[PDB]
Amino acid sequence: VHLTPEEKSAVTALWGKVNVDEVGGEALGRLLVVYPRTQRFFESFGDLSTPDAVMGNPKVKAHGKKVLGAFSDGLAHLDNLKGTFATLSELHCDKLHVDPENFRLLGNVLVCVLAHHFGKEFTPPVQAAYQKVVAGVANALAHKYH
Amino acid sequence: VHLTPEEKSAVTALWGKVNVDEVGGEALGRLLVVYPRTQRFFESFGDLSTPDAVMGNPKVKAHGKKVLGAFSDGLAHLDNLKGTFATLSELHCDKLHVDPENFRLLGNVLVCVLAHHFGKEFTPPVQAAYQKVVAGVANALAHKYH
Amino acid sequence: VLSPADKTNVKAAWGKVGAHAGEYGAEALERMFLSFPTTKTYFPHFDLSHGSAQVKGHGKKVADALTNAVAHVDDMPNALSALSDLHAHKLRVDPVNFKLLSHCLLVTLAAHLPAEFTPAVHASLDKFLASVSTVLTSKYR
Amino acid sequence: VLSPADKTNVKAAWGKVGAHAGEYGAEALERMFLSFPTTKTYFPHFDLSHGSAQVKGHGKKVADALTNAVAHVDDMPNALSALSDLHAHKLRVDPVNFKLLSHCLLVTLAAHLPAEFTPAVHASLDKFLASVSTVLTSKYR
Ligand code: HEM
Ligand code: HEM
Ligand code: HEM
Ligand code: HEM
Ligand SMILES: [Cl-]
Numbered sequence A, B: 001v002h003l004t005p006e007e008k009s010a011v012t013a014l015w016g017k018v019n020v021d022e023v024g025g026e027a028l029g030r031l032l033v034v035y036p037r038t039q040r041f042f043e044s045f046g047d048l049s050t051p052d053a054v055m056g057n058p059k060v061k062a063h064g065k066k067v068l069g070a071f072s073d074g075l076a077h078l079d080n081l082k083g084t085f086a087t088l089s090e091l092h093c094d095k096l097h098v099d100p101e102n103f104r105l106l107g108n109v110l111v112c113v114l115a116h117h118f119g120k121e122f123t124p125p126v127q128a129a130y131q132k133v134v135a136g137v138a139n140a141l142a143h144k145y146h
Numbered sequence C, D: 001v002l003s004p005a006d007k008t009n010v011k012a013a014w015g016k017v018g019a020h021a022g023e024y025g026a027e028a029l030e031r032m033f034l035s036f037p038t039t040k041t042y043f044p045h046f047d048l049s050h051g052s053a054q055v056k057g058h059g060k061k062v063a064d065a066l067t068n069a070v071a072h073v074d075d076m077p078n079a080l081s082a083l084s085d086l087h088a089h090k091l092r093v094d095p096v097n098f099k100l101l102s103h104c105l106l107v108t109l110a111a112h113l114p115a116e117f118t119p120a121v122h123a124s125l126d127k128f129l130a131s132v133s134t135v136l137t138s139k140y141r
């Protein structure tokens, strides 16, 4: 990731305010609702039939928290996303069989979730820094696909 | 790019058999025909009203030879497309205002032209190596955009 | 296609935008210019500075057209034909860029309508923006 | 929107494919898997080695659907309804992969039908594969 120092300052500042448990569950639920196709990976999660069934699903919430947890660690190694996410990249490809395009969809949803949460504090330029981070993370997660 | 020695040799040896003149005129012409939207940058070339008019247009023919020329030269710096295309990347951005997405369209048209020409010889694995180069060239050409 | 439910969601969310449409259109453009700098290649003639009057003016125009597709949600292809002709014949904008704008438009709405920007409304607005984008790119070739 | 010339063009090109459609089907798949390895994520249960009978058989299936689609070029939505169902409700492949298969199919035709792969025919086949992709992804949400 090519983040100017001031971009990196802005990313870090805001991330300080996020409730990863909360945001993680919201981001993953919205993905499942906005792009139902993504539900292909979660048939063991139960009822994903309506927005409410998805958003309040205890399994979706727990998973979302796991995913954003891994993501937050990524935010402390912006310097080395590839190394950071290498075992996770292998797993998604080799065990989970997740098309990497899914990582970009989540990134965009997450950005909407941060806009939702921070309102006006999520400025055009703050969004531009997060767009870069999200693409960096999606890229690192797909680096080991073969 | 992240070309393997055996992938590097396949690219290299096929290119040795290419008539840049003919292949360049065909790739650029095919592009204006298949994706008519790309004509927005070649209004001054003349009559692009028909496939026959495009393929026949000499301004098109000569522009394609110039493009494939520069592409050709880049195959010599496969280990630093970015450094080879920096200036050309700046020009395309700051002077020509060409959306880098066009670079990807061309690359793919180019792959179809090579298959067209080489038939049998353009095997799945040879195609795979060229897809890597074309992507690499598109990425390098888009690198200095701001 | 847009379901009865989607249509209700879109009229409702867009209903709330109201008189802010223009301003939100301008903000969506600015967000796009900052986050996806390649979209700038289409506005070489614009002053893309923060608070550009051209951007303000362009935002209004985009906003008016979205407002028109909402008013004619059951006849979008005809309500937007003219705009679809312009885009196909003169602007000739690459299709991927429509997805970048749609995205920045959802960010803007989210940033301004926290209460209406529910998962369900989000899904509907996404399908809607996608449909508008599809109409505008329908006469390309 | 396929124009009458396109429909003609498509019918011709495909006409020549004839008894080899299944082989071109299988070759396109093989080029897809190699060029765009992320596409392999949808076939973890397949043997993706060169000349697998799974790939071969799958090529046939695909090629056959294309024939049926050319045959009902005027009624794709209808000729391919069961397929749009399958893709939208079971398979759920991300739309970008349709462009990667489409491309590998053009490449296959180009390599095998040199005389018929004129610029205008190339133009038509692309528009056609796009149309097919639209139909197959039309009931996703
Ligand atoms: C920010 C991007 C993502 C990160 C950092 C991430 C991280 C993780 C982690 C830490 C796990 C648990 C690993 C384990 O079981 O050992 C996991 C599992 C999983 N992820 Fe990802 N993930 C991401 C995106 C996605 C997306 C977008 C999808 C699908 C649309 C997905 C599908 C899965 C599935 C299906 C599992 C296994 C769940 C189960 O145990 O049943 N992931 N992910
Ligand atoms: C393979 C990728 C490409 C390469 C290596 C390339 C290279 C070149 C070169 C060497 C020039 C000569 C101009 C100069 O040095 O002053 C040029 C000009 C130009 N290119 Fe690119 N090009 C590529 C793709 C494209 C595409 C896809 C488009 C648009 C569809 C495009 C549009 C133009 C235009 C409009 C000019 C100016 C020519 C003129 O003024 O007559 N290029 N390019
Ligand atoms: C849903 C998405 C879009 C809508 C509703 C929309 C709507 C419009 C409208 C109403 C106009 C003004 C035409 C007039 O003067 O009457 C316009 C012009 C224009 N649009 Fe689109 N547009 C969309 C997407 C895009 C995208 C994604 C781009 C490029 C990134 C783009 C590039 C342009 C340009 C360059 C102009 C002309 C500006 C000028 O010369 O003042 N449009 N659009
Ligand atoms: C040109 C567009 C496409 C056509 C015409 C097409 C056609 C078909 C057909 C005819 C079948 C078999 C249905 C049956 O078993 O009765 C099928 C299944 C399948 N397709 Fe699609 N397909 C297309 C694009 C794609 C793409 C791009 C992908 C993913 C990269 C894909 C993934 C699959 C999978 C995973 C199956 C099931 C495989 C199995 O378990 O046998 N398809 N498709
Ligand atoms: Cl979907």
Ligand SMILES: [Cl-]
Pocket (backbone or CB within 6 Å): B034, B035, B036, B037, B038, C140, C141
């Ligand atoms: Cl086009």
